[PDB]
Design a protein around this ligand. Sequence first.
Ligand SMILES: [Mg+2]
Lengths: 210, 253, 42, 119, 180, 86, 54, 108, 89, 50, 162, 50, 226
Amino acid sequence: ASLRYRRPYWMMFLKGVDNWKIYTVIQQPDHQRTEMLYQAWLGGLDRPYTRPKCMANQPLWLSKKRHMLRKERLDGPETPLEKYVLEWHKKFHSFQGTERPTPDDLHTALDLVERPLDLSYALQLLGQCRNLNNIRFAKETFLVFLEACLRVGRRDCAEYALEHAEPLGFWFIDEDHRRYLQGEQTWYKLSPLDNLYYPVEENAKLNEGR
Amino acid sequence: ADMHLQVVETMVGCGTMKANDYFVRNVLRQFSWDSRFLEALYVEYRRQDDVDMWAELTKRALVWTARYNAPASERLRRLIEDDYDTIRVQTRTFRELAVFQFRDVEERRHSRDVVNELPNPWYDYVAHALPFPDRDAGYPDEYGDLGQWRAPGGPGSPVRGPGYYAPPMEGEHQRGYTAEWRDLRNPMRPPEFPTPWERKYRQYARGQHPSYDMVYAGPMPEIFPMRRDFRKPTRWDFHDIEKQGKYRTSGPY
Amino acid sequence: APKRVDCLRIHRNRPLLLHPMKDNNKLLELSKLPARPEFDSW
Amino acid sequence: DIHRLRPTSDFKASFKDWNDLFTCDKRQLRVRGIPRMTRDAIRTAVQAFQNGNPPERFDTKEEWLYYKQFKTVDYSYRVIPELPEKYRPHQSGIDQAPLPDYREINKMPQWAECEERRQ
Amino acid sequence: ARAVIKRRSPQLWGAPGAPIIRMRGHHVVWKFQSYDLVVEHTHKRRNSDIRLLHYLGKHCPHPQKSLWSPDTPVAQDRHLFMLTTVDIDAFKYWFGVKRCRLSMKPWALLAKAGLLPPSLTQNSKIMPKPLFDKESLMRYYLANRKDEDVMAREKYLNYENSMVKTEEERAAERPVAPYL
Amino acid sequence: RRPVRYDPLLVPRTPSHWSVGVDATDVRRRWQIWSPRDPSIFHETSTRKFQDHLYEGEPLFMQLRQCPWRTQAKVSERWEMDEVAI
Amino acid sequence: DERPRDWTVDEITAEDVKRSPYKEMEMQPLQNLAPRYEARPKGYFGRTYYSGMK
Amino acid sequence: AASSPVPHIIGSKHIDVPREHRLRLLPGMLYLLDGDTLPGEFTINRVLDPTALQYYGRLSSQIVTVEAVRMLVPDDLRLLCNCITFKGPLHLPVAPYASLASLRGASQ
Amino acid sequence: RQIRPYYNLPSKSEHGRKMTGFLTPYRHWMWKQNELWRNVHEAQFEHLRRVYKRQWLESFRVNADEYIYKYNITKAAQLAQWECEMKEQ
Amino acid sequence: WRLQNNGRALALGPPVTIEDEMQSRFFSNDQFLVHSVKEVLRIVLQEHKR
Amino acid sequence: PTMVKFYHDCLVRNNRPREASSLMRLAAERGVHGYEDKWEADVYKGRPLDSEVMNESEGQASSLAFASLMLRGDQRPLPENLQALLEEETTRNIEAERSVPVPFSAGLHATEINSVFRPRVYRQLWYKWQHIANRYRPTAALKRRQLAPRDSPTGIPGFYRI
Amino acid sequence: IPQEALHWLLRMIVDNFNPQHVHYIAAMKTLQSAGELDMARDVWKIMERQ
Amino acid sequence: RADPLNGGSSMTLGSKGSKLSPEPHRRRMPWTAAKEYVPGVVLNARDKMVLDGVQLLDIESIDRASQLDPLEVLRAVVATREYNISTGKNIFQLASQATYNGRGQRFYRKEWQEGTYDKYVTLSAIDFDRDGNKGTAYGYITFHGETTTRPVQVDFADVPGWYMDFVEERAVPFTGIVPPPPSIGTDVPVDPHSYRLKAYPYYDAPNPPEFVERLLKDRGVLPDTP
RNA sequence: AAAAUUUUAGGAAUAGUUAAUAAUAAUUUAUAAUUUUGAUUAGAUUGUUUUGUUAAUGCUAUUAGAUGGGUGUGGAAAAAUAAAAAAAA
Ligand SMILES: [Mg+2]
C-alpha cells in the first residue's frame, strides 16, 4: 500500500496536494503550457515561470512573495484597534513566521476596545492566542478583558467568560470580580490613584467623599 | 576489565560491602565488563541484611546486564536460581522454560521406552557426501551411436568422438580414440580401471555373467500384430524417463 | 453509479493478437493527418 | 461471512443445524449445490473452529468497496487518483479569479449596527 | 518492488529469495498427477533455463496395491502402498548447511519418512493446544535442572563433532615404535 | 496425567462436553469390482487399476466408507472399553 | 606524521590499523565475513548421476 | 583530568602562534585556563538558547557547575572557538596527582 | 497472514482502512501463548538442522579421506608410467 | 543509553591486558633467550595446571 | 495541424505561454483538426506586450515594474524600495532554478526528447499496408504475419525504420 | 563449528588443488584456537599423506 | 542480524517476527527503524460534534461583514478549546499551562504505566512553533530506573494522550539547566523502600484468570454455553 | 568477460569508425579497423544431440518462451494481459 514504485521518487511522503498525477505528466508540452498559464493566473510574477521539475507545492520564495503581496481583507481601518489588528496580522501571520504572541501584546490589543466591532476583533485575537498560538494568559488578563467588555457595555460576554474561564485560559479571577459578574456586588474595582470605586454608576453611591 | 575484575573479586572476598560501589563507579559505565563481575557481586549481594535489599540489588544487576550488553552467564543465572525459594526472582525466559519442559519430558519418555531404542539409518548418519559416486557404474560412454551426428557433444556431453568412423587424428587423440577412451558397449570387458587398480580385477573383467544357463522368465514377444510404440502414461513407474524414447530392438528373441 | 483484442490464426492454428498501437508513436498522427493537403480539407 | 466474493450468510438455510453443519463434507456441499468459493470458506471456518479458532475476524467488504473506486490495477489498497482533462481553474472557463468587493465586505454587520443603535 | 505486482502469486521478499523445498506439481489431469520434491528459490525461476537448485525426489499421490504380499508377510503388509523417492544426503546438506526453507506438504511427507518430526499443521482435534504457566514451568525446571557440564557435553556432541577419540584411540594413534 | 506423568494443562484431556462426530464403528463396507471383461477397463490407458503393468482391473476389492449420521439419532453415546474377543 | 606505520615497498597498507607491523603477527580468525558453500550445482542435479554432465 | 595527569591540557597562557599558522594549527586544540579571559580577534556570541544549553546539563550537575558558554568567530569566519566557563569546585573527587589539581578554581 | 479480529481498535477513517493493527491486551496475552506453543516446534527444527549439518560434515571428512588415499595411489602409479614413457621416447 | 566502541577509535576501554612486544622472529638473540626462558616457565605452568 | 503543433511545441520550449495560448485559441477558432477543443481563456487580456514595456522603459522604470509584474487584483503592490528587493530575490531564485541540470535529459527539452521526424515518403508503404490490413482497426499495430506467411517476405523491405 | 576448517582443507584437496603451507598453518592455528588438537594432528597427517 | 528473534529459526516465515532486526533493513530508508508507535489515526480523529452548532471564522478573513457577535466568538473559542483536547491533551498543551514551561517535570503516556511498563520522560527543553500545539520537545528518558545520559527528542510528542504531574520542586528556571534525573541503581543507591523494580529482564507476569478463562472458552476446553 | 559452430538461385564494399594515451568527461598521435577464407545493408528465422523416417554421422521438425527515454526507485528493471502460485499469528 505504498506509492514508492507507482510515482516518481521525489514524491515520498507526499500528502495534501490536490492531485499528484498532474506533476507526473507536467513535463509534456501541453501540460507545461497549462501550468505556466496557471502560474500567470495566480499572478505575482513578471516573466513566464514554471514549477521546478521535482516539486509539487509552490516554491518557498514564490509562496512567501504571494503571501506578502496579497491585499488585506480589511481596508481603511477606521479605528486604532483595526490598525493594530492589521499590524498584528502583518507581524505574526506572516508566511512561515516563528515569533509568538505575548500577554503584553494581548493587553495592548485589548486596551484599544472602543466599539462592539473592536470588541469582537479583540476576542478573535484572544481566542487565536489561546488556541492557535497556545499562550498562557497573564494574571491581569481577566481584568483587562472585563474592562474591555465594560467599555462597550457587554456584561453577558463577561459573565459567560466567568462561567467557564478555565477553557478560555483565565486561570485566575479576582473574588470581587466574580461577585460583580455573579451579581453579589455592584462595584467591580477600585482606582487607588483616585480613591474611587468602579463602575461610576455606584461610585457616587458608595464613595460619596474624596 | 580483568584488572578491575581482580579488584572486585578481592573486595568481595574481603567482604568490604563496597565492591558494588567500586563496580558501579569504575567498571559499569566505561568498560565492556562480562558476567563474571555479577557472578561475584552476587556473593556480596547475598550478605545484605534484608532480603528486599538483596532482591533489589539482584534485579538492578540484571537490568545492568540488559542495558550494557553483558548477557548473564549460565553460572550467574544458576546462582540466582539456587535462591529462588527465598527471592522468587526468575532467570529463565518463558520461551526457554516452555521449550525445556517439553524437551525434557520427551527425552525421559524416549529413554524409558525400549521399542524406539533401535537405530534409524535415515536419521543416524549421512551415507555419501562427495560430489561424485564412489564406484564406476559404467557411464560415461565417450562414443556416439547410430544416427548421432553430433560427436563430440561439447558442453555438458561426455561424448568425445563419433561412434564408428572419424576423420584422421594425430598422436594422443588417435591413441585415445582407438584404444584408451571408455567404451560402454564393449561386451568382453568394461572400461578398465587406472593402474594399479586393474590387475586385481583381471578375472572379473571377462564377459558379463558366468551362468549361460539362464531361463527367461519374462513375457513373450508379440509377433503379431507387432506393435511399434508403447507410450503408456503411467502413475507409479519411476523408470518412465528411461522407458520413453526411441530404442533399437535387436536381441535373441 | 477488458477490451477484446482481435485474433488471427496464422500458422499451425497459432493465434496472433494485434494489440492497439502505443499512443506516443508518430504513426497514429501520421494516419490522422490528411493525405493530400492541396485537395482535402485541413 | 467476511468476504464479498464468498458470502456464507446467503446459505444459512441450507444447513439444518449445528451438527449438520459440522458433519457436512465438501462432497456433501457440492451435492447440496453451494458454489466453490463459498463452500471452501465454510469448510475453512468449520476447520478453524474445530482446531480452536472461532470465526472472529474483520469484515473487509466496506474497505474493499472503498478501495475499488480508486482503480488500482492490482488491488493493492493504495490511492490512485484519476487525472481530469481540465483541472486548472483558468482552462475551465474562468478568465480570472473573482475580485472581492472590499467596499461591500467592509460594511459593519447587522449585529454591530443594532448594538450601536442601542448604545 | 513492482509497479503492478503479480497479485495472483506474491511472496515476502525479493527475487531470487531463500531456497525452499516444495512439491512442484505437473499440469495434467488428476488421474496421472505426481509431485516432485525439489528445492528452489522463493520466487520461481520459470524464466531462465535453470529452474531448481536440486532434485530431491518424486511422490505418487495415488496409492497402489501391495505387489510384494507373496513375499515375507509382516503386519499390515497388504495395505495399499504410496511409493515415493527422497534424497537423504542432499536433503540434509540443504537443510543443515544451506539452511533452506520448507513447505508443509514436504514436511508431512518427511514426517512419514522419519527424517523430521510431524509438522506444525498436523494437529488433531482430540486435544487443544497447551496452556503455559510461568510459575509451573519454573517449578518443573527447578525440579529437573540438568548439570552444566552434562548439558554442555550433550550439545557439543549434538552440534560439534561426534567422532571424539577416547584414551584408547589416542594411545593407539601415538607412535610407540622407534620414531622415524 | 498429574512412567512419566504429563501436566494436565500442557496435555489437555479431550473435553467431555464435546460430542463424537465419527468413530471407528461408523464405517460401512463397500464392495467394488473392476472386471477386465469391460473393454473400458481392459484398455491399456485405464486408471481403474491399482497395478501399473501387471494386468488390468481388480478382482472384488473392498473399501470402507463412513456414515457421519450418528448425531442424527435422538441419543448417541460411545463406550470406551478394551477389546475382549481376542 | 602522515606516513602510515604499516607502509612498506609493497605499498599494501591496511587503513584504520593502529597496531605496528611487528607487534602482532598471527593467522587470527576473521569474524566479519561468513563461510560460503557452493549452491549452484555443475551438471548433476538429482535422480541418477549417469555421466554427470561435466 | 580529575583522576589522571594529562600533559598539555592545562597551560599558563593561550597558545601563541603566528597568524599565518594560526588557522592551520589551532583546529583540534583544547586546553584549560584559570579565569574567563578570551582570545582576541574573536567576535563573541554567548549561547543563551536553552535547546543548545540542555546538552550541558549532565556536565553541570555531575562534574562542575557550568557558568558560561561562548562561541568565538574569527575575522575570516574559518576557525571557531568554544569557551565553557565553569564556576565552583569539582564535584568528583580529585587526586593530588591529577591535572586539575593545579587549577585554583577546580580543586579548591 | 496477520489476523485482524473484529475487536481490534477501529480506525474511524473514511480515507483508509477501517481497522487498525492495535489489539486488546487479551489478544497480546493470547498471542504470546500461541507463540510459546510454536516455539516448542521450532526448537527441534534447529536441533535437527545442526545435527544434519554436523553429520554431513563428518561424512564428507571420512569419504574425502578414503578418496584422497586412493587418488594418491593412482596418481603415483600414473606418474611412474609417464616417466617410463618419457624415457623411452 | 550507553557508550559504545567505534571502528575508528575505542572508547569503552579494553577487557584484557595485552603485552606490547614484538614477535619472536623480530627478537634479538639475547631477547629470544629471555623469551625462551619465559616460554619454558609457561610450559611448566601449563603442565602443573594439567 | 503539423505547423500548429510544431509552433506550439517551440513556444512552450522557449517559455512563451501567452503566445502558445494565442496560437491555441487561433487553432480552435479556425477549426484545425484535433484543436477544436483546445480553447482556453486569455489570462493576459489586459497586460501589455513585452516589447511595449521594453519600449516604455527605454523611453520611470520603478513605476513600470508594477505594470510589468502581473497582479491578481486581490494582490496589491508594496512600497517600491521593498519591491525592488523582492524582484531581485525572485530573479535570483528563478535563475538558480533554471541553472540546475536535468539528469537523463541529455540537455534536451521535453519537446526535443523522442522527437524524430522524417517525410511521409519514408513510411508511405507502411501507411498503405496499414490502411489495408487494418483498414478498420486504425489503432492496431501493423505487425508482420498480417500480410505475409512465415518463411515468406513481407511487402515492405525497410519496414520499421531501416 | 571448528570442524569446518578441516572440512575446507579436505574440500580443497578433493577439488584437485595443492594445499599450500599457509593453508596448513591456518588450519592448524584455527583448530588450536578452537581446542581441536586431534583435528590439528589430522591436518598434519593430511599434509604428510599429500 | 544484530537482534534476531529466537536466534536463527526459519521453521516458518512467521517465526522470524514481523520484523527481522530493529535497525532499518535498507540503508536508504532510515524511517523503517523499529520503535514503539501510537494510534495516530484515533488520536488525531477529534470529535466534530463540539464544533457542530457553533459558528466559526477563518483566520485569513478579517473583513467587518464576516465578524460575529462577541458571545458567539466566546463560545467559538471554548468550542475550539474543547475540540483541540477532545481526544486528549498534548505535551505542548500541558507545558503551556505549567510554570517554567514544565521544565524538569515528568511526562508519561497512558500505556507507559499499566502492566509491567514503567516509563516517563523528564522534560529538558521545548521549542514551540507558531502553532503552540506543535513543536519539538527534548528530555531525558527514564525506563525502570535507568536514565539516559543526554536529552533526546520525544517521539510522537505532537500526538495527544500525554499526562503530567507537576511538582514545584522539580521546576527548573530558564536561567539554569535541567539536571538529568539520577539513575536509581547507578547514580543513587538502590533502595527497596523508595523505588521497587516492577519487572526484571527475565520476569514474566502471571497469567490473569480472566485471560485464562477466555482462552479456554475460545479453544473449547471450558463448556461455554449461551 | 572469452573460443568453436551461423541462412539467401542471378555475391560488394562497410563506417559516430581501429589502436595507443599523463586523456574518468580523449581539442592529441598513427602507414588505423571491417571484408571475396564472403563483410555491411535488405529478406527469412527464437541459437546448441529432444520431431518424423531410414540399413544409415542422410534427410525433415522444434514458443529453452531471453534487453537503452514510463517512474534513477531498488541488492538486481524485467515494472502496467493471463499462465495453476501460500506471501511475515
Ligand atoms: Mg555470413
